[PDB]
Design a protein around this ligand. Structure first.
Ligand SMILES: Cc1cc2nc3c(=O)[nH]c(=O)nc-3n(C[C@H](O)[C@H](O)[C@H](O)COP(=O)(O)OP(=O)(O)OC[C@H]3O[C@@H](n4cnc5c(N)ncnc54)[C@H](O)[C@@H]3O)c2cc1C
Ligand SMILES: CCCCCCCCCCCCCCCCCC(=O)O
Ligand SMILES: CCCCCCCCCCCCCCCCCC(=O)O
Length: 564
């Protein structure tokens, strides 16, 4: 009805990170008619704009509120897996850390035309950096805004750095400079613009919404891609009125393409609902098989986390980031609001987890462990739960105790999971299994166990033991290797990556879902341009790599670049 009597050159399923980039580049010359379908609303919330309000976005209406299947290897728990639901997608709800990983991550993909030397200029072309000028590893002029964080905790950030040096880590002055090793300690840059969230809606989509050839629908939930076999994508079915709503169809112009941009959870889900998937699974829900692809929904990679936390001594009460945001009765400090509005500075600019380190726990080629230091104390062993608790704590009249947290992440994990269907209803949540700690060697568990040892060694250093008064998590009860393993099974949570569910592959790779041109095997006019295509997860947060893929895909589709 908003699409009745319209042919589109491109239909984007999802209005998230990759989609905002494609919408901008594909609508640019004005010849092409581009439709964007997003299930969630427009990007207008103040909780999106203020980085510290990430605490409020978890388990909110701007999240999909996805829970995994019971994981029997994780003390029979469901895992919450946060995902953004609005224009800008997970770029709008994320912790804003800017990581490319290492050159070696892209070389390890082994896909023709996607080596480190192929992808570097696409990272650089996207970037404007406030704190690095142009050079081999940094661009000036791209739409992304990257900066050094505008909040520093003078005592605790300094102390973490001195402690890391005491246990023998070297400083890394730029985690995105591929001329030096990934390992070491320092400051993560953030996708922020003077302390405001610089998401891909703000940077890519919002500036070009005036365009006549670009149509964006919100509250538009795609139910399947329409594919005919007389196999050719025709367009897309969606509802604007939830599950009971009338199914509408958006149709392609001749030579038009459907681009899947629904992310590493919802893209394989929708492909299965469209008959692109393993025949065994599709037959169980009476879905006609159009392209029998074993790899759709397999190879799910996510970077699991656990943490330590420790209170500061009574004489250091009031020095934590929790003290910079909340007063002793849980009111937001006037000083914090004033610094944010006057100069884009202070605690409201922080997502908390923007200092840390990459570490090799056992002489691996690339670091297996990421550390995120937070100058505030977790009150739950589940860091995402604690961020929720921090949002709900406002105006409750209590004091959040001053301390620190170290989050340990298996950043190059060996375990893989899957996403499938639990029902034939396209409005049902996916069957989601993260598969943490299932790798056959127990490498991921070993990484997190050694991470806890490492965090305890850092907290025992001169530089930090000056501040600290004991340990809250994992605590006195958790000392032996077997006690640590049990704590990890019970507390493990997502560091919120999720890639690889529609893996890109070389010719002859029967486990691949898309080729090196991002075309789905056995369907004409169907591409995937989102986190699902990443073959092997890079070390670090996965937002910047998604934008790099979307930039290169835009260049390919508009004839400006080739791959191979
Ligand atoms: C809490 C959190 C913290 C993170 N922290 C960081 C970080 O610090 N730094 C970093 O670089 N990365 C981080 N990430 C990861 C990064 O945000 C993602 O990897 C990246 O944004 C994914 O981009 P995408 O385009 O693949 O998907 P998304 O940005 O998730 O976009 C997918 C879109 O499809 C929409 N959609 C789904 N189903 C349908 C349907 N049926 N119809 C229509 N639309 C639909 C969704 O609502 C969504 O908007 C974080 C992620 C989360 C959730
Ligand atoms: C616990 C999490 C903190 C949440 C922060 C709430 C901030 C309330 C302060 C009053 C609103 C700030 C002014 C509105 C700024 C809108 C954002 C912007 O335009 O950059
Ligand atoms: C701006 C937020 C300040 C919050 C202070 C809360 C106290 C510290 C708890 C730290 C928990 C570990 C970090 C969890 C990171 C969650 C975000 C993410 O994964 O993207």
């Amino acid at each position: 009805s908003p699409v009745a009597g319209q042919k589109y050159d491109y239909i984007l399923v999802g209005g998230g990170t990759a989609a905002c980039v494609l919408a901008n580049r594909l609508s640019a010359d004005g010849s092409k008619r581009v439709l964007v379908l997003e299930a969630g609303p427009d990007n207008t919330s103040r909780d999106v704009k203020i980085p510290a309000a990430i605490t409020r976005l978890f388990r909110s209406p701007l999240d999909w509120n996805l829970f995994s299947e019971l994981q029997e290897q994780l003390a029979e728990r469901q895992i919450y897996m946060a995902r953004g639901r609005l224009l800008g997608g997970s770029s709008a709800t994320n912790a804003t850390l800017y990581h490319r990983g290492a050159a070696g991550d892209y070389d390890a993909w082994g896909v023709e035309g996607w080596s480190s030397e192929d992808v570097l200029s696409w990272f650089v072309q996207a970037e404007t950096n406030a704190d690095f000028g142009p050079g081999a590893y940094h661009g000036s002029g791209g739409p992304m805004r990257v900066e050094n964080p505008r909040y520093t905790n003078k005592q605790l950030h300094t102390a973490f750095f001195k402690a890391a040096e005491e246990v023998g880590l070297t400083p890394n002055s730029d985690f995105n400079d591929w001329s030096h090793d990934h390992a070491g300690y320092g400051t993560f840059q953030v996708m922020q613009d003077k302390g405001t969230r610089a998401d891909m809606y703000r940077q890519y989509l919002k500036p070009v919404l005036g365009r006549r050839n670009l149509q964006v629908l919100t509250g538009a939930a795609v139910t399947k891609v329409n594919i005919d076999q007389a196999a050719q994508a025709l367009g897309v079915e969606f509802s604007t009125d939830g599950p009971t709503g009338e199914r509408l169809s958006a149709e392609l112009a001749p030579g038009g393409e459907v681009i899947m941009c629904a992310g590493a959870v919802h893209t394989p889900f929708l492909l299965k609902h469209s008959g692109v998937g393993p025949s065994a699974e599709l037959k169980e829900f009476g879905i006609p098989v159009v392209s029998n692809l074993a790899g759709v929904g397999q190879n799910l990679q996510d970077q699991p986390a656990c943490l330590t936390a420790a209170p500061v001594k009574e004489k250091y009460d009031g020095i934590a980031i929790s003290d910079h945001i909340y007063n002793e009765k849980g009111q937001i400090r006037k000083r914090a609001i004033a610094s944010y509005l006057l100069g884009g500075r202070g605690g409201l600019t922080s997502t908390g987890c923007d200092r840390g380190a990459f570490v090799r726990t056992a002489g691996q080629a690339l670091p297996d462990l990421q550390v995120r230091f937070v100058p505030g104390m977790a009150l739950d062993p589940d860091g995402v739960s604690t961020y929720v608790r921090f949002a709900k704590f406002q105006s409750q009249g209590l004091k959040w105790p001053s301390g620190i947290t170290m989050q340990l992440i298996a950043c190059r994990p060996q375990s893989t999971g899957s996403v499938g269907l639990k029902s034939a209803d396209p409005f049902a949540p996916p069957k989601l299994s993260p598969g943490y700690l299932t790798d056959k060697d127990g490498a991921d568990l070993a990484t997190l166990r050694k991470g806890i040892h490492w965090a305890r060694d850092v907290a025992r250093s001169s530089a930090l033991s000056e501040y600290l008064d004991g340990e809250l998590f994992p605590g006195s009860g958790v000392v032996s290797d077997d006690q640590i393993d049990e704590y990890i099974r019970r507390s493990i949570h997502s560091s919120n990556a999720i890639t690889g569910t529609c893996k890109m592959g070389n010719a002859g790779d029967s486990s691949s879902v898309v080729d090196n041109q991002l075309r789905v095997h056995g369907v004409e006019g169907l591409r995937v341009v989102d986190a699902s295509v990443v073959p092997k997860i890079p070390g670090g947060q996965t937002g910047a790599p998604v934008v790099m893929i979307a930039e290169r895909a835009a260049a390919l589709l508009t004839g400006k670049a080739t791959i191979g």
